[PDB]
Amino acid sequence: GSHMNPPPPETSNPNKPKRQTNQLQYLLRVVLKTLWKHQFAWPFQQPVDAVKLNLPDYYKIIKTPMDMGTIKKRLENNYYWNAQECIQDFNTMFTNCYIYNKPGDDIVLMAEALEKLFLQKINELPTEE
Ligand SMILES: N#Cc1cc(Br)ccc1O
Ligand SMILES: N#Cc1cc(Br)ccc1O
């Protein structure tokens, strides 16, 4: 893509420690799956393309970008050590949306719908075994 967009977050790095846990399996098979098919998922399924959207300030404002396409790759590629890393990626994605956009904007309402589902599913995150 455009040189004006940053490289996406890392999804592969042999130096980084990782492991599978039952909680990470639940984050892929239940949490990500549920959110990915929501009617309002599409803006969040890949990094924000600030060039295409004519938002030249986006990566001036949002210095820790995250998206569900990145999270999907990180889960499928076993990038994470623990559930907390992955949950933090989701939280970063939501908070970027809420800091960049005005309350009540369409993308905000879309993010809020995904967040409500997310919180329901994370309340049920299984005990680590
Ligand atoms: N595991 C799983 C899963 C995740 C996404 Br996103 C879509 C379909 C699936 O079956
Ligand atoms: N945040 C954000 C954002 C994402 C898409 Br896709 C389009 C416009 C936006 O302002």
PDB file of C-alpha atoms and ligand atoms in Angstrom:
ATOM      1  CA  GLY A   1       0.000   0.000   0.000  1.00  0.00           C
ATOM      2  CA  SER A   2       0.835   3.693   0.275  1.00  0.00           C
ATOM      3  CA  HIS A   3       4.143   4.891   1.803  1.00  0.00           C
ATOM      4  CA  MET A   4       2.024   7.429   3.683  1.00  0.00           C
ATOM      5  CA  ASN A   5       0.436   4.712   5.816  1.00  0.00           C
ATOM      6  CA  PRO A   6       2.671   3.100   8.502  1.00  0.00           C
ATOM      7  CA  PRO A   7       3.573  -0.586   8.358  1.00  0.00           C
ATOM      8  CA  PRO A   8       0.870  -2.552  10.169  1.00  0.00           C
ATOM      9  CA  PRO A   9       1.554  -3.903  13.683  1.00  0.00           C
ATOM     10  CA  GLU A  10       3.855  -6.929  13.856  1.00  0.00           C
ATOM     11  CA  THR A  11       2.071 -10.314  13.384  1.00  0.00           C
ATOM     12  CA  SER A  12       5.201 -12.504  13.150  1.00  0.00           C
ATOM     13  CA  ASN A  13       8.452 -12.261  15.084  1.00  0.00           C
ATOM     14  CA  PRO A  14      10.570 -15.319  16.005  1.00  0.00           C
ATOM     15  CA  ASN A  15      12.158 -13.344  18.851  1.00  0.00           C
ATOM     16  CA  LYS A  16       8.878 -12.909  20.675  1.00  0.00           C
ATOM     17  CA  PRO A  17       7.803 -15.543  23.187  1.00  0.00           C
ATOM     18  CA  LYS A  18       4.456 -17.142  22.591  1.00  0.00           C
ATOM     19  CA  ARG A  19       2.288 -20.009  23.631  1.00  0.00           C
ATOM     20  CA  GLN A  20      -1.160 -21.381  23.191  1.00  0.00           C
ATOM     21  CA  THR A  21      -3.529 -21.127  26.178  1.00  0.00           C
ATOM     22  CA  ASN A  22      -7.164 -22.169  26.473  1.00  0.00           C
ATOM     23  CA  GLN A  23      -7.966 -18.452  26.962  1.00  0.00           C
ATOM     24  CA  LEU A  24      -6.250 -17.545  23.674  1.00  0.00           C
ATOM     25  CA  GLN A  25      -8.171 -20.362  21.941  1.00  0.00           C
ATOM     26  CA  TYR A  26     -11.418 -18.872  23.310  1.00  0.00           C
ATOM     27  CA  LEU A  27     -10.361 -15.406  22.080  1.00  0.00           C
ATOM     28  CA  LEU A  28     -10.076 -16.794  18.531  1.00  0.00           C
ATOM     29  CA  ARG A  29     -12.919 -19.328  18.415  1.00  0.00           C
ATOM     30  CA  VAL A  30     -15.525 -17.321  20.387  1.00  0.00           C
ATOM     31  CA  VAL A  31     -14.528 -13.671  20.771  1.00  0.00           C
ATOM     32  CA  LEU A  32     -12.932 -12.789  17.430  1.00  0.00           C
ATOM     33  CA  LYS A  33     -15.386 -15.050  15.555  1.00  0.00           C
ATOM     34  CA  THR A  34     -18.411 -13.290  17.163  1.00  0.00           C
ATOM     35  CA  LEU A  35     -17.112  -9.786  16.458  1.00  0.00           C
ATOM     36  CA  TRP A  36     -15.837 -10.516  12.955  1.00  0.00           C
ATOM     37  CA  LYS A  37     -19.281 -11.460  11.633  1.00  0.00           C
ATOM     38  CA  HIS A  38     -21.117  -8.529  13.216  1.00  0.00           C
ATOM     39  CA  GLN A  39     -22.891  -6.217  10.703  1.00  0.00           C
ATOM     40  CA  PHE A  40     -20.667  -3.374  11.908  1.00  0.00           C
ATOM     41  CA  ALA A  41     -17.283  -5.217  11.809  1.00  0.00           C
ATOM     42  CA  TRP A  42     -16.100  -4.083   8.394  1.00  0.00           C
ATOM     43  CA  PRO A  43     -14.308  -0.760   9.351  1.00  0.00           C
ATOM     44  CA  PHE A  44     -12.332  -2.740  11.932  1.00  0.00           C
ATOM     45  CA  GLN A  45     -11.287  -5.736   9.801  1.00  0.00           C
ATOM     46  CA  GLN A  46      -8.061  -4.119   8.526  1.00  0.00           C
ATOM     47  CA  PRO A  47      -5.760  -1.190   9.408  1.00  0.00           C
ATOM     48  CA  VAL A  48      -7.166   2.286   8.799  1.00  0.00           C
ATOM     49  CA  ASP A  49      -6.075   3.374   5.324  1.00  0.00           C
ATOM     50  CA  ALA A  50      -5.642   7.095   6.069  1.00  0.00           C
ATOM     51  CA  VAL A  51      -4.749   7.834   2.456  1.00  0.00           C
ATOM     52  CA  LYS A  52      -7.869   6.297   0.949  1.00  0.00           C
ATOM     53  CA  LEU A  53     -10.103   7.890   3.624  1.00  0.00           C
ATOM     54  CA  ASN A  54      -8.441  11.303   3.217  1.00  0.00           C
ATOM     55  CA  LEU A  55      -7.501  11.467   6.900  1.00  0.00           C
ATOM     56  CA  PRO A  56      -3.892  12.770   6.731  1.00  0.00           C
ATOM     57  CA  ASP A  57      -3.801  13.498  10.476  1.00  0.00           C
ATOM     58  CA  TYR A  58      -4.900   9.989  11.521  1.00  0.00           C
ATOM     59  CA  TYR A  59      -1.443   8.582  12.220  1.00  0.00           C
ATOM     60  CA  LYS A  60      -0.417  11.967  13.742  1.00  0.00           C
ATOM     61  CA  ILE A  61      -3.160  11.415  16.373  1.00  0.00           C
ATOM     62  CA  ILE A  62      -3.231   7.607  16.648  1.00  0.00           C
ATOM     63  CA  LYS A  63       0.281   6.487  17.498  1.00  0.00           C
ATOM     64  CA  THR A  64      -0.706   2.946  18.642  1.00  0.00           C
ATOM     65  CA  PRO A  65      -3.010   1.668  15.850  1.00  0.00           C
ATOM     66  CA  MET A  66      -4.741  -1.676  16.103  1.00  0.00           C
ATOM     67  CA  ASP A  67      -7.455  -3.517  14.137  1.00  0.00           C
ATOM     68  CA  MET A  68      -9.165  -6.899  14.038  1.00  0.00           C
ATOM     69  CA  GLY A  69      -7.365  -8.065  10.948  1.00  0.00           C
ATOM     70  CA  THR A  70      -4.118  -7.696  12.862  1.00  0.00           C
ATOM     71  CA  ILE A  71      -5.627  -9.402  15.912  1.00  0.00           C
ATOM     72  CA  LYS A  72      -6.928 -12.290  13.735  1.00  0.00           C
ATOM     73  CA  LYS A  73      -3.465 -12.842  12.272  1.00  0.00           C
ATOM     74  CA  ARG A  74      -1.877 -12.654  15.746  1.00  0.00           C
ATOM     75  CA  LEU A  75      -4.299 -15.275  17.058  1.00  0.00           C
ATOM     76  CA  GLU A  76      -4.029 -17.554  13.994  1.00  0.00           C
ATOM     77  CA  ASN A  77      -0.220 -17.277  14.016  1.00  0.00           C
ATOM     78  CA  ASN A  78       0.080 -17.828  17.805  1.00  0.00           C
ATOM     79  CA  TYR A  79       1.795 -14.491  18.343  1.00  0.00           C
ATOM     80  CA  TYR A  80       0.602 -13.931  21.912  1.00  0.00           C
ATOM     81  CA  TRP A  81       1.937 -15.184  25.250  1.00  0.00           C
ATOM     82  CA  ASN A  82      -1.337 -14.595  27.138  1.00  0.00           C
ATOM     83  CA  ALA A  83      -4.932 -13.436  26.903  1.00  0.00           C
ATOM     84  CA  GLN A  84      -4.085 -10.023  28.382  1.00  0.00           C
ATOM     85  CA  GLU A  85      -1.968  -9.081  25.360  1.00  0.00           C
ATOM     86  CA  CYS A  86      -4.826  -9.892  22.992  1.00  0.00           C
ATOM     87  CA  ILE A  87      -7.494  -8.180  25.147  1.00  0.00           C
ATOM     88  CA  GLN A  88      -5.232  -5.103  25.239  1.00  0.00           C
ATOM     89  CA  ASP A  89      -5.178  -5.106  21.406  1.00  0.00           C
ATOM     90  CA  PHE A  90      -8.988  -5.062  21.313  1.00  0.00           C
ATOM     91  CA  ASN A  91      -9.089  -2.286  23.886  1.00  0.00           C
ATOM     92  CA  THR A  92      -6.528  -0.281  21.919  1.00  0.00           C
ATOM     93  CA  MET A  93      -8.664  -0.636  18.744  1.00  0.00           C
ATOM     94  CA  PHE A  94     -11.790   0.645  20.528  1.00  0.00           C
ATOM     95  CA  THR A  95     -10.006   3.502  22.263  1.00  0.00           C
ATOM     96  CA  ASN A  96      -8.348   4.670  19.007  1.00  0.00           C
ATOM     97  CA  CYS A  97     -11.841   4.972  17.502  1.00  0.00           C
ATOM     98  CA  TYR A  98     -13.179   6.902  20.476  1.00  0.00           C
ATOM     99  CA  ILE A  99     -10.222   9.317  20.630  1.00  0.00           C
ATOM    100  CA  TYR A 100     -10.134  10.053  16.896  1.00  0.00           C
ATOM    101  CA  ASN A 101     -13.865  10.420  16.219  1.00  0.00           C
ATOM    102  CA  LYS A 102     -16.640  12.552  17.725  1.00  0.00           C
ATOM    103  CA  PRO A 103     -19.109  10.860  20.127  1.00  0.00           C
ATOM    104  CA  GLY A 104     -22.147   9.708  18.263  1.00  0.00           C
ATOM    105  CA  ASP A 105     -20.376   9.512  14.866  1.00  0.00           C
ATOM    106  CA  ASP A 106     -21.331   6.399  12.868  1.00  0.00           C
ATOM    107  CA  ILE A 107     -17.997   4.636  13.334  1.00  0.00           C
ATOM    108  CA  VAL A 108     -18.195   5.302  17.070  1.00  0.00           C
ATOM    109  CA  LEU A 109     -21.657   3.739  17.282  1.00  0.00           C
ATOM    110  CA  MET A 110     -20.273   0.803  15.267  1.00  0.00           C
ATOM    111  CA  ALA A 111     -17.318   0.388  17.625  1.00  0.00           C
ATOM    112  CA  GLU A 112     -19.637   0.649  20.632  1.00  0.00           C
ATOM    113  CA  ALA A 113     -21.779  -2.218  19.314  1.00  0.00           C
ATOM    114  CA  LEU A 114     -18.695  -4.425  18.916  1.00  0.00           C
ATOM    115  CA  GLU A 115     -17.414  -3.376  22.332  1.00  0.00           C
ATOM    116  CA  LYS A 116     -20.678  -4.342  24.028  1.00  0.00           C
ATOM    117  CA  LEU A 117     -20.429  -7.834  22.517  1.00  0.00           C
ATOM    118  CA  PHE A 118     -16.747  -7.997  23.377  1.00  0.00           C
ATOM    119  CA  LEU A 119     -17.383  -7.224  27.087  1.00  0.00           C
ATOM    120  CA  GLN A 120     -20.135  -9.893  27.243  1.00  0.00           C
ATOM    121  CA  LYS A 121     -17.724 -12.510  25.860  1.00  0.00           C
ATOM    122  CA  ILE A 122     -14.744 -11.455  27.960  1.00  0.00           C
ATOM    123  CA  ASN A 123     -16.812 -11.698  31.157  1.00  0.00           C
ATOM    124  CA  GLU A 124     -17.038 -15.420  30.203  1.00  0.00           C
ATOM    125  CA  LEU A 125     -13.337 -15.841  29.404  1.00  0.00           C
ATOM    126  CA  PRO A 126     -12.597 -19.322  30.820  1.00  0.00           C
ATOM    127  CA  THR A 127     -10.450 -19.968  33.819  1.00  0.00           C
ATOM    128  CA  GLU A 128      -6.893 -20.592  32.590  1.00  0.00           C
ATOM    129  CA  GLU A 129      -6.160 -24.320  32.591  1.00  0.00           C
TER     130      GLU A 129
HETATM  131  N1  LIG B   1     -11.656 -20.277  15.010  1.00  0.00           N
HETATM  132  C1  LIG B   1     -12.508 -19.613  14.394  1.00  0.00           C
HETATM  133  C2  LIG B   1     -13.045 -18.665  13.452  1.00  0.00           C
HETATM  134  C3  LIG B   1     -12.678 -17.321  13.495  1.00  0.00           C
HETATM  135  C4  LIG B   1     -13.204 -16.441  12.560  1.00  0.00           C
HETATM  136 BR1  LIG B   1     -12.713 -14.607  12.617  1.00  0.00          BR
HETATM  137  C5  LIG B   1     -14.080 -16.867  11.583  1.00  0.00           C
HETATM  138  C6  LIG B   1     -14.444 -18.192  11.529  1.00  0.00           C
HETATM  139  C7  LIG B   1     -13.938 -19.101  12.450  1.00  0.00           C
HETATM  140  O1  LIG B   1     -14.319 -20.398  12.362  1.00  0.00           O
HETATM  141  N1  LIG B   2     -11.466   5.861  13.348  1.00  0.00           N
HETATM  142  C1  LIG B   2     -11.697   5.734  12.333  1.00  0.00           C
HETATM  143  C2  LIG B   2     -12.126   5.622  10.985  1.00  0.00           C
HETATM  144  C3  LIG B   2     -12.180   4.398  10.326  1.00  0.00           C
HETATM  145  C4  LIG B   2     -12.681   4.332   9.063  1.00  0.00           C
HETATM  146 BR1  LIG B   2     -12.722   2.681   8.128  1.00  0.00          BR
HETATM  147  C5  LIG B   2     -13.143   5.475   8.433  1.00  0.00           C
HETATM  148  C6  LIG B   2     -13.100   6.689   9.083  1.00  0.00           C
HETATM  149  C7  LIG B   2     -12.603   6.781  10.368  1.00  0.00           C
HETATM  150  O1  LIG B   2     -12.583   7.980  10.996  1.00  0.00           O
END
